[PDB]
């Protein structure tokens, strides 16, 4: 049988010795030629249905030879096209002949999912009647026939007649519903065994028909067989067994077997019995009937196996990221933008830490990359872990080189030479190559070379020139399929791609939301937690400045918390001030006012709502823009916020899509929002909390949410330090971690405890919530962290003075984490 | 040549005598069999590419026979499928054999434009190299190849040699880029003339290659030719002549011809010259290269003609109503809904008039329809005129029957027997059948029978049972294609479908607009003329009642005009009152107020806006709905309307989409809206008229716009009376005509004069805009007709006291007409 060779970064199938050349193949016996051709097509079909590979055959001659007319025609039938170069390319070195097979269908959601079949097969074993002949359906015809089946006569008069005279002339000829089969007495029982699978499936697949046994094809005469040889009882059961043996695949309820009518009649010659004749009426079948199992092959594990009949049908008719597939062009342009003229190392943060940690790594990488003048080099601490494989101790880093005029190469750097070094790099290159095809949906020709380098001071195949990345279009298309592959795993670039999907999802909701600037002057935006309410507020001011043609300092941003005010002031898009400064300082020069987290405002310091209305109403261009952003789920106090009653909060805009948190984070928010609705606060208006998110909305970005309880303060602090070190070891930046506590009075106590456990991790410096641009871990209270967002958030002991607000601190906490969240509740 | 015979309601091609039956067809010589097969395939290809038809052949035998294996295989290659029944079905009666060919591609915008090719061809004459063999591209392969082309070596060393030793062995074998050809000296000149056509386009279509003449294929030995026969100088001329004769179709600029390198080298034997060898290098071609003209046929006029190379490429690579195709399912249910259990006559208005004028027509039609128990019978005064054909005097009516278990039949009822009557019905049935396929996009098997009935007291071809409408699915799918056919012409059913498309376009814009009820309480809707501003006002009040669960009388509708108030009050959806009644009566029990055409209000009676706010704000559910609908393009006075300044008119919804007027009417409005912007009224605010329609919005509904000037007052009336009579003759109801004059004081003058000329047309009854339910022609002033709409509108002598308002009456008048408008301006 055919087995896959495991010492290569591809699917290599060795078929043994194959005679090549039409002159050499003609001299062979038909049986041997058929066996060799069948083995070659088995390998080719397996590689077409398994994502591509190489077919290795050893030829009996030294000089170059052609593959052969029969093999070429069989491959053409396999791919149903004369474009034989687009899938198969041949090379030969010495006594070995190679055929490099491309993948037929690439990706789980191909662009031609509803057009071309998923499987290539030698024969589908689906016969249907075509006028006076029985023909087999190829892959496209079988696909169309199964699609059709998936959705929800003069011959009768002879059939009812009970006896037939010898030599009777049948008026009707052979046609779509009538077949005349000559019945021979020498192999009469063998003849019945073989003719049933050929014609019964043909009629049942197309409207049914009649099958006459014992009637000459040309002369249409009734002859039958010898009455001595034929046993009508023994003959009847064999036909019944043969018809019931045919495999049938049902797409409907019920699933009754094949319905047919068998009639055995006496043949009379000169008024004397001469023999028996067989009439078969096959009723049309509600589904497909197979003459035998389909001849389609696929590679599972290290073996080549044939697909079962029910498994073949399922593939013909029928973590994956939906968001990554549609945004793959913009995601690639952000992270993996190919640079013209020089070779770029990504990530730059991880590359810098690698060269400083290991001496000589910078010079080793540069010496190997001299021949390459353009491309991108993607670094990682272990590319096997990024592909859910096992890490090999002693590997410094893995690099995937995607350069022009060169096939992709996966470099593995070892700090000392190891016997398993080449085996580890080969398995990761082979795994990455298969994912780029079967998961990233790459429709081109791709091969990943496995190269091993050592820091301290089997042969690869020579792929055809069409496997090399010729220009920008091929490298860009290959990188876009790597984005889909990366988004399905957990790694450094999986999260950096996951972060950019959230920014693309938020920009989609903003475009719908940004249309309200021309229609409204005073607007009350009721956003939901994690819906990007703060992000739109920043985006509108960029649009307000352009639309109204006012300078930046005319727009005023008012918030409740000091740390968020600093964030807005850093971007220089407006003047950002706290509520207290808004009431105290005079703002007669302000034209437009944007208010954020209005539910957290307080009225004891003054009447902020009236003053904001007065300033905007008295603008030069009539009424100015006064957009009030608020979310009643994140109310931080039980006092009166000074807002008008819910009836007067019009016109109103609603943000219901959660577009700033990962999938497990979003599910946590929606589950927690249900608890808030069941126990509304007394100060909160009754009808405001009746807001529901989108019925079926998924961010398509995977994250992490772990709850660890019954841990002491010392025990919690080590877990935070260990998790941060694990993230920083993989290459994350320290500016992606935020630690949030219940109250601002406990910030100083937890800060000393955090440094005590984190001093062992080579970082002893933290930043406050007031400084977000610093490359330090932010440790501050949840309430003072409102309006900000971080990639990794650790919540330590969520607590508040009033148990009524206790359900509200969690939702104000989980909404601050974009991808990773770790909560350590009270014991 | 093959010519279609014009005596049937289909494309019938007579191919003459054809031998049928495999036993009979085996006995013929290859030449005669090939000629017969090629004739049959020409007919089949013509009918496949021409919309379907019948192939008539006269067989030489009486008993039923099969068509033959070779013909079946040729048809299978023609349709590229073994499903030979879905396109060809055979019938035989006596000495004639019929093949009923279905259309390959139906409609100008099929569902498979990018999936299946448009043309069926015997051969595309496109050859491409397939490994070591040259293969011709089928229709699908040629389609894919042209789609790809439309988007914007050891053999070299031997080529550089200047002489070749006799018997030299070429190291390389024949491959994708190398071809070895033996050169025969007996017919050496004629050999070259035919070798170039099939091999040079093969290389040029796929990356190019090398062509060697004079080398043995099997042994790779260089032989050349004899010196006495081959002349190197003259041999070059024909080779470059033959390569330049290949037709080439370019998709790009520039269009340089095929580029190749020719070298003729001496063949030396034992150091002595023996002959010449020809080496050809073919550079890859930027576009497709044809060995000869494609073998595709089509029926044009009364002949069967072959498509030229330039035309064949265009069809394979590349009035029609786009809106009709989208809404064909909804349009069918409104008009042509098949009734289960009885036969329905449409239109009912035309059916009633037909039986009244002509005695015995009801008895004749009912007698003919007895066998049919289900379906729809579509009546018309002349179906030929509906299809842009010529009217035949003496025809009472034409009826198209679409019934269950019966092919469509077009009945032509004649007052008296006429010899031409059968020709008239056959030509209309043939035209209607082709429109249903080539224009309506019907992908099934359709035949339209032509039957002639006479009120006063060639054989019909028997189509197969697959042409009969078996059930509701086939009848429904056939009528949806008739909807698209009708919408492309000008007729009664074309206009009734045009009115329903406008009602579906308005319902599309309402769904977008209806989302503002949840977000707004006070709203200022700035609509454009013809945008359906009044229609949304009625639809909103039905949504307000459902959403707020209030009783119907709780909603108040306020309008300036009395005729508009009457129309709204008749629908029993709210309380409709005039502005004057609003200020006079007390409405303390009203919760929601909807104001329409607010730009026509006046302050001479009091503050209507102030009273509106007080009633709505004091509602039980806080602030009630107060939506103000206005259109500044249709202001009927220069006084103050009482609306707040343009700066205080917020929030806003803008209806910019013209969805209530046909295409000619809509283009007239936008042209006139430009004049209004070029000179706004002084009372009109500065920035309100800056509302623009969509950049590219088309209704896709045909209409009529005719402007006749310099006619006297008497001449206007007879034109209106004649136009009304011709419309009523076709079956248009009188309630579709409105006559609009400039001022209400001239209404009585024009009413008397219109009746003077219209009395000759058997209609004397006129009505005012206060009553629109009556089946009468409405005649009032333009300003009095605000808010209402009619299908046919006649504008007579537009005029106003102030020339500033002069452009305002035309835009207000034109917006009243939905499909037909006739303007008679002052001379
Ligand atoms: Zn079934
Ligand atoms: Zn070109």
GROMACS .gro file of C-alpha atoms in nm, chain B residues 563-564 566-568 570 734-738 740 767-780 784-790:
model
   33
 1390UNK     CA    1  -5.872   6.766  -0.019
 1391UNK     CA    2  -5.572   6.608   0.153
 1393UNK     CA    3  -6.050   6.419   0.328
 1394UNK     CA    4  -5.823   6.147   0.188
 1395UNK     CA    5  -5.647   6.088   0.521
 1397UNK     CA    6  -6.124   5.827   0.502
 1561UNK     CA    7  -6.119   5.659  -1.523
 1562UNK     CA    8  -6.004   5.704  -1.161
 1563UNK     CA    9  -5.642   5.714  -1.286
 1564UNK     CA   10  -5.675   6.053  -1.462
 1565UNK     CA   11  -5.637   6.392  -1.295
 1567UNK     CA   12  -5.479   7.013  -1.285
 1594UNK     CA   13  -6.526   6.514  -0.976
 1595UNK     CA   14  -6.325   6.737  -0.744
 1596UNK     CA   15  -6.025   6.648  -0.529
 1597UNK     CA   16  -6.255   6.629  -0.226
 1598UNK     CA   17  -6.375   6.291  -0.362
 1599UNK     CA   18  -6.107   6.051  -0.486
 1600UNK     CA   19  -6.286   5.720  -0.420
 1601UNK     CA   20  -6.534   5.789  -0.699
 1602UNK     CA   21  -6.460   5.646  -1.043
 1603UNK     CA   22  -6.436   5.990  -1.202
 1604UNK     CA   23  -6.175   6.221  -1.351
 1605UNK     CA   24  -6.057   6.472  -1.090
 1606UNK     CA   25  -6.024   6.838  -1.193
 1607UNK     CA   26  -5.896   7.105  -0.952
 1611UNK     CA   27  -5.552   7.234  -0.408
 1612UNK     CA   28  -5.420   6.893  -0.520
 1613UNK     CA   29  -5.130   6.889  -0.272
 1614UNK     CA   30  -5.074   6.559  -0.093
 1615UNK     CA   31  -5.255   6.344  -0.352
 1616UNK     CA   32  -5.119   6.148  -0.647
 1617UNK     CA   33  -5.264   6.004  -0.966
   0.00000   0.00000   0.00000
